[PDB]
């Protein structure tokens, strides 16, 4: 929620980014 630059989440990028934002100690299947 800041002037952050959109990262091109191509392939695995989406996955790692998803884990980063949603939460590491939880993506025990959704990643």
């Amino acid at each position: 929620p800041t002037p952050e630059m959109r990262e091109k989440l191509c392939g695995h990028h989406f996955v790692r980014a998803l884990v980063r934002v949603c939460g590491g100690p939880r993506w025990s299947t959704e990643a």
Binding site: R6, F14, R20
Partner: peptide, 26 residues
Amino acid sequence: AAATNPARYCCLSGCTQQDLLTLCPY
């Protein structure tokens, strides 16, 4: 640009933390 697919959308255009947060589930 536009894309009826988040993974594709994030790849083609790109996604931030906010963008991803909006896609975060329970």
